[PDB]
Each structure stands twice: as structure tokens, then as C-alpha cells.
């Protein structure tokens, strides 16, 4: 332990070098204490970048990489003793004091030399801490691990704590032991096992896969499991891009028990710290940041009436025209209020729009633009997905051993904007399933043995081609699209895209494409091949942390969903009802009797229009704008 003690001393010298860390720990402890007096207790997790401490000690920083299993254990021991000597509030929660709260070490930045990828991970670099960012398909459920056993015979007055770290949490590979709890203890003592004071760490077997696009053609994504034990439990859902900082470790004796003997070795990545980054193009994990500077920004424009049109223009800058369509998709993006009632009847604030368009009307790209604009962005085509699979798969999983719920899109759909393309081609069973589950925004999932009902409230855009190649006015719209009005009425907006062509507009489209094409991508050599590289992003973890820019716009609108919650206002109410007067009984045969749905649709549309204005309540301007756009869409103009 002389080298162990030396590493403890060097880590202490580190803590001395960087006050901010001990300050952060101090802030953590006071956060723990006050919240304890009051919840949401953050764990004893401490985050120190690789680029940190790299300066004062090259040797220690290197040996962390070379032999993490010998560097981090003493480092965390020193972390813990420093914290408990510096928290200075030992008395409260004396029960948990004996159970002990380990202090955990995390990291920031990219190793590069160590941190490359799951596929690039090879045995040549093993027992060394690395980091990889990947998609996780499989997540194992949590199971506590009892490493410190609390057991005691009343007569002894000793309270034996037999602590066992067999395979996972241990780094020294301590010998396996069963923790029998001998009922004789040592001196024939009953040795009652005292529940509580006993450490339990909820274990996770989480396997992470590489990018399909980073994987070369014909190569399946490379998958490797990671372990999380009541320290990093459950930030991430399956199928999310996530960066994990883990050490490459082997277990199972490599399978070389006695003889077959050519079987592979059992290895696995145990990850101390994890940085989830599932945002597209390595963004902010779909979590838009916020600053008071950005807060005060935009707002002054929101007072100006033209801001809504400016936002509409900003959308799909690669597309020409479709300004009303862009306004509609903007209204889509902003989320309406889910009105709740003291019964099973809960009003939906979700926005659902159906659109029919000729092939190559950019609507597919439009759906793609909505995708890359939305946070969740659950999108597919009519042939793209299996309806049951996307809604719910009630098949069992072999590792689980019993019947499992597997909602491909539905559970992914709820609490996020979702998309669907070519719904005419979609399986009719899926169509009738989505029918009335998107109206009620909830699915009973009572199919098969499992009957648990799970909510599915989300905003959906539909882009299905006409039955004929192009919409023919001579044919009825329902002749042009075979999709029944069932839940087709339950689309808050309906859109028809016809690729009719006029010299002025044709020139406009052509010039737009000409500008988009000759334009060399930002920077780069004019004669330079496309790179679309990995960006070699060193920043990992907290290191990663009139026209308007798009991601900035997305951050603003997300901030809006967070903040702006308008309520239906009386003058807006009167405008709405005055419209509805003739809207429900319009003499013109616009087809699709609007009924009671469209009243709620326009309510939501005016609410989101107020959200554009950032007003804490709706305004009649929102109501009349929504009515104007709705009549625009319904007339087909």
C-alpha cells in the first residue's frame, strides 16, 4: 500500500493544486445538507477532466491512463477522506454514515489516444481507462449488489460488516466469496442480518453500439457492455448516442477453465463516468442551453409582429416558397398546452397535421427538416416501419425470460414531436391502431398477457402521396387519397401539395437550387472532397457542455416551451367562437365536416401563436391568424 499511499498523497497534492474541485465538493456537501434538511441528492460523484491535473503531474496523469486500476482507487480514497474531513457535518444521517457513501471520480475531455470508438476498441489496450460514444440498444434493469453485508448478534455488541467486492466493483480482483451469514458468527452467535447499513448498488448491464454511418459498409455496429451501480443509474434510454468513459476489463477467466479451449475471452467495459450526447451531429443531448443574454434576445422581436414570419422564413431555408407551409410547420414545432380535467377525459395540446404532396415536393426533406429540427423527432415511412413494432411489441426477451413490452415508436413518440411519411403505404392495421390512439393520445397495450396502459401523447406530421401520382382536382381528395377520414379529421391541419409549375416560380426554384449547389460548404477547399468527419471533439462531458440562425432558433423555441404557457384569453375566445359560427356550418363544401375537433385544434393553434409572441396568455391576434391559416389550408389556397 506504500505505492497506494503515495498515490493518495499525490492526489491530495492535486486537490491542493486545484481549489475549484474542493470548492465544488464543498458546494456539493452544502447542497446535500440543505436538501437533507428540506431531495434530489446528487451522489458523491466528482468530475475531474483528463486535461485537468495533466499539467502539474505528467507522471500521475499518464499513470491514470496506463494503470487506472491502480491510480483511481487511491485517488477516490483520498477524495473520500478529504470530503469527510471537509464536509464537517458528520452527525446527521448517522445510519447512512455506517453504510458509508463512496465518493466517485469522473472525467472530462477526450483521451483520443485512449478514447477512440467501440469498433476501434481492441484487447491491445485493456485495463486502461478509455471513452467511447455510441448508441445503446440493450439496457439491463437495475439489481442492487450487496457488497458490504451488515449482520450482528444482539449479545455481541459488535455489528459485523463483512464486505465483499467479488467481480464488478472491485479492481484488485478479490477472491469470490458467498456471504453466507454464518448463524454462529464466530463464538456461536446468532448474527442477525441487519437490513439497512448494508451497501446495495443497482447493477446495470448496458451495451453500447457504434454509429451505422461510422461503421463501414457491410459492417454491423460493434457492441460492448457497461456497468452502472447506484451511481450512474438510468439517465439514458435505449437507442441513444452516449459517450461513456470506461476501463477495458476482462472477466470469466477468459473461459480457459480446464479445456472449448479455443473459446473467446470474457471482456467488458466498466465505466466510471458517462457523458450522454444523443443530439444530432453531437449537439447538446437535445438539451438547449440558456443564458440571460439569449433570454433577453429574441423577445424584443417577439413584440414585433413580423417575428413569426421571420421564423417561418428561417425554416427550410433550402426550400423555396411554401411560406404558409413553413408557418404551419412552425406552429407544429411549438407545443400546445395539454389541458387536464378531473376525470379520465384529458384534453390534448398536441399538434397533428396531415399533408399530401406529389413525389419530390421536398416534403420528404421537409419531414427530414422537421426531424433535424425537433428534439425527439420520431420519423419513418409507410413501408419504413412495422405498425405493431413501432406501436408495441409484446414479445418476450430471452435474457429477461418473460414477456416484454417493446414500443418501437410509440413510447419514443410521447413527449416529443414525431413524423410519418407515405402513410398511404402504411399497413392498414397500423393505420387503424394509430386511429383514436392519436385522438386519445394514449394506448392501452392490453394486448396479450400484459395489460398496462401507457400514454402516447405527441405531435405528428403526416406526409402521404396521393393514390394517383399527383392530386387531381377532378378526382375527390378522398379519391386522391384512400386514407379514410377516420382520424384524418383528427389532424389539426390538413395540407395538399401540388407540384404545379409556373415560369416565375419555376425560375425561383431553379435559382434557389443553383445557389445551393455551386455553394461550397462552409470553409474547406473549393476543390476538396466531402469530409463529414467525426469532428475529433476533444470536449467531453462538462467540457462538451433579416435572418436568424437555426440552432439558436431551436434553443429559443425550446426555451419557449419551457417558459411560455399562454392561457385561452376572453377576447381570443370571442374571436374563436365568432369564427366557428360559420366555420362549422360553412356554405362552401370544403369537405371533412370540422365538428368539435377543429375547435380544439384552433384553440391549440392560437395558443402556440401566443407562444410565438411569448405572451403569458393568448391574444385575439393569435385566434384570427389561426383561423385565417386554417381557412387557407381548407380552401386549398
Amino acid at each position: 500500500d506504500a505505492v497506494f499511499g503515495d498515490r493518495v498523497r499525490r492526489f491530495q497534492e492535486f486537490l491542493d493544486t486545484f481549489t475549484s474541485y474542493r470548492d465544488s465538493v464543498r458546494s456539493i456537501q452544502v447542497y446535500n445538507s440543505n436538501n437533507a434538511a428540506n431531495l434530489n441528492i446528487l451522489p458523491h460523484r466528482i468530475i475531474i477532466s483528463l486535461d485537468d491535473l495533466r499539467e502539474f503531474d505528467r507522471s500521475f496523469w499518464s499513470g491514470i491512463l496506463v494503470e487506472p486500476a491502480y491510480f483511481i482507487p487511491p485517488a477516490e480514497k483520498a477524495l473520500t477522506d478529504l470530503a469527510d474531513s471537509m464536509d464537517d457535518v458528520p452527525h446527521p444521517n448517522a445510519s447512512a454514515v455506517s453504510s458509508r457513501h463512496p465518493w466517485k471520480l469522473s472525467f472530462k475531455g477526450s483521451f483520443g489516444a485512449h478514447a477512440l470508438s467501440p469498433r476501434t476498441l481492441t484487447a491491445q489496450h485493456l485495463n486502461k481507462l478509455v471513452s467511447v460514444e455510441g448508441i445503446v440498444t440493450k439496457t439491463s434493469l437495475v439489481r442492487p449488489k450487496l457488497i458490504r453485508s451488515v449482520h450482528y448478534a444482539a449479545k455481541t455488541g459488535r455489528f459485523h460488516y463483512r464486505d465483499y467486492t467479488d467481480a464488478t466493483t472491485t479492481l484488485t480482483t478479490r477472491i469470490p466469496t458467498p456471504a453466507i451469514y454464518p448463524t454462529e458468527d464466530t463464538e456461536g452467535n446468532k448474527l442477525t442480518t441487519e437490513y439497512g447499513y448494508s451497501t446495495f448498488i443497482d447493477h446495470q448491464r448496458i451495451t453500447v453500439q457504434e454509429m451505422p454511418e461510422m461503421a463501414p459498409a457491410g459492417q454491423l455496429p460493434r457492441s460492448i457492455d457497461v456497468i452502472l451501480d447506484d451511481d450512474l443509474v438510468d439517465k439514458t434510454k435505449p437507442g441513444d448516442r452516449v459517450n461513456v468513459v470506461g476501463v477495458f476489463k476482462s472477466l470469466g477467466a477468459g473461459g480457459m477453465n480446464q479445456s472449448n479451449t479455443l473459446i473467446g475471452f470474457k471482456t467488458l467495459i466498466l465505466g466510471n463516468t458517462v457523458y450522454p450526447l444523443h443530439a444530432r451531429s453531437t449537439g447538446v443531448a437535445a438539451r438547449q442551453m440558456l443564458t440571460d443574454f439569449d433570454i433577453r434576445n429574441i423577445n424584443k422581436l417577439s413584440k414585433k409582429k413580423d417575428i413569426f414570419d421571420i421564423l417561418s422564413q428561417s425554416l427550410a431555408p433550402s426550400i423555396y416558397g411554401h411560406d404558409h407551409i413553413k408557418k404551419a410547420i412552425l406552429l407544429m414545432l411549438m407545443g400546445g398546452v395539454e389541458k387536464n380535467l378531473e376525470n379520465g377525459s384529458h384534453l390534448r395540446g398536441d399538434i397533428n397535421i396531415l399533408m399530401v404532396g406529389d413525389p419530390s415536393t421536398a416534403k420528404s426533406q421537409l419531414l427530414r427538416f422537421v426531424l433535424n429540427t425537433a428534439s425527439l423527432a420520431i420519423a419513418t415511412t409507410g413501408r419504413g416501419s412495422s405498425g405493431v413494432g413501432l406501436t408495441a411489441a409484446v414479445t418476450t426477451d430471452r435474457e429477461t425470460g418473460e414477456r416484454r413490452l417493446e414500443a418501437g415508436a410509440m413510447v419514443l413518440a410521447d413527449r416529443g414531436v414525431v413524423c410519418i411519411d407515405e402513410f398511404d403505404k402504411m399497413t392498414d392495421v397500423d393505420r387503424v391502431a394509430i386511429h383514436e390512439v392519436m385522438e386519445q393520445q394514449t394506448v392501452t397495450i392490453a394486448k396479450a398477457g400484459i395489460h398496462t396502459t401507457l400514454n402516447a401523447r405527441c405531435s405528428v406530421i403526416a406526409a402521404a402521396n396521393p393514390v394517383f401520382g399527383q392530386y387531381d382536382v377532378n378526382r375527390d381528395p378522398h379519391q386522391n387519397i384512400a386514407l379514410p377520414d377516420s382520424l384524418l379529421s383528427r389532424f389539426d391541419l390538413l395540407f395538399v401539395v401540388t407540384d404545379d409549375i409556373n415560369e416565375i416560380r419555376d425560375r425561383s426554384i431553379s435559382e434557389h437550387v443553383l445557389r445551393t449547389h455551386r455553394y461550397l460548404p462552409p470553409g474547406y477547399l473549393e476543390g476538396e472532397p466531402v469530409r463529414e468527419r467525426l469532428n475529433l471533439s476533444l470536449a467531453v462531458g462538462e467540457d462538451a457542455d433579416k435572418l436568424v440562425t437555426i440552432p439558436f432558433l431551436r434553443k429559443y423555441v425550446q426555451y419557449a416551451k419551457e417558459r411560455v404557457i399562454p392561457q385561452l384569453t376572453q377576447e381570443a375566445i370571442n374571436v374563436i367562437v365568432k369564427n366557428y359560427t360559420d366555420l362549422r356550418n360553412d356554405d362552401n363544401t370544403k369537405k371533412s365536416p370540422i365538428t368539435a375537433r377543429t375547435l380544439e385544434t384552433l384553440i391549440r393553434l392560437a395558443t402556440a401563436h401566443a407562444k410565438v409572441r411569448l405572451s403569458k396568455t393568448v391574444n385575439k391576434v393569435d385566434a384570427k391568424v389561426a383561423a385565417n391559416l386554417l381557412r387557407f389550408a381548407l380552401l386549398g389556397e
Binding site: 483528463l50 495533466r54 475531455g109 483520443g112 489516444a113 468527419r533 475529433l536 476533444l538 470536449a539
Partner: protein
């Protein structure tokens, strides 16, 4: 440095972020809007060959440069973590030249120190690769990709000397 050097001109041409400390009319053509003049406190990328002079000209410089992400702190962090690992060409095909110009403009020893260290490490690795002779390797090509063009030239000349030697002593 050679006045007629091609890389000299190329590095000079690269635009760099410049913040306008002056609002001077008539220079709108620099923004491709000649009618609209320059306004105060505006950041704009401008060609390096223009840029360094524009920082020079000014009392208060008329236009002020911006600290490049090209020289961002994370760049030096990545360098110090592993000089070999970084793909310099991806960062730039003229990174070393740009650093030279910046240091002549701004004598930052620490930047000079880290640049020298990176150059040294890539120099040992380049010597290893050039000394390797076919009788090609994927890792050597990957390293070539990771290197700045001028580094590639050094490798080319060194490996050329190696090949001349090996053809010389091993055969008439």
C-alpha cells in the same frame, strides 16, 4: 519565408475573424454590400493577408482580430494530450504556417512551446515512417493524413533520401 512561396500566399489568403473597432463608410464591398457601410463593434472573418495589416492599422486599431478556434484552448489541450493523435491536416493544411504568423504577430512562448513540442513529436514519428521502406502500410498513410502539408513534404524528401540510399548500397 519565401515571398514566392505558394504556401505563403495560401496561408495569407485564409480568412480570420476580425471585429471592427471602427465604423468606416465605403468598405461594404468587403461584405459584398458596398452600399451598406461598416458599423462599429462588428465581428467578421477577413483574409489573413488583409487581417494582420488591419489589426496593425489604427492608437486604437481600426479592426481587431478574434482569438481563433484554430488556436482555441481545447486545441492546445488536444495537442498536449497527444501530439501524434491529432490530425493536423483536418485542423488545417497550413496550421504550422498560421501559428508562425500569429506568433510573429503575438509572441506567446507557451503557444510557441507547445507548437515546438508537437512539431518535435511529429518529427520523431515522421522519421520512423520515412525510415520504413517498402520492398504500403495503412498506419503510415493514416499518419500522412494526420500531418500538415509541409510535414508531408518533409516526409516525402526524407523518405526519398532513404529510398535513394537503399537503392544505392543494396544494388549497383
Amino acid at each position: 519565408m519565401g515571398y514566392y512561396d505558394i504556401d505563403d500566399v495560401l496561408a495569407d489568403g485564409t480568412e480570420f475573424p476580425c471585429k471592427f473597432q471602427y465604423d468606416i463608410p465605403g468598405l461594404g464591398y468587403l461584405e459584398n454590400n458596398p452600399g451598406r457601410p461598416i458599423t462599429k463593434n462588428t465581428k467578421l472573418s477577413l483574409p489573413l493577408w488583409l487581417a494582420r495589416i488591419l489589426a496593425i492599422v489604427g492608437p486604437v486599431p481600426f479592426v481587431e482580430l478574434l482569438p481563433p478556434d484554430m488556436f482555441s484552448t481545447k486545441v492546445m489541450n488536444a495537442i498536449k494530450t497527444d501530439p501524434v493523435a491529432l490530425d493536423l491536416h483536418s485542423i488545417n493544411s497550413h496550421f504550422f504556417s498560421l501559428a508562425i504568423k500569429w506568433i510573429m504577430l503575438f509572441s506567446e512562448k507557451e503557444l510557441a512551446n507547445v507548437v515546438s513540442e508537437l512539431l518535435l513529436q511529429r518529427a520523431q514519428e515522421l522519421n520512423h515512417h520515412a525510415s520504413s521502406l517498402s520492398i504500403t502500410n495503412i498506419a503510415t498513410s493514416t499518419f500522412l493524413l494526420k500531418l500538415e502539408e509541409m510535414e508531408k513534404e518533409i516526409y516525402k524528401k526524407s523518405h526519398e533520401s532513404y529510398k535513394d540510399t537503399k537503392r544505392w548500397m543494396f544494388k549497383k
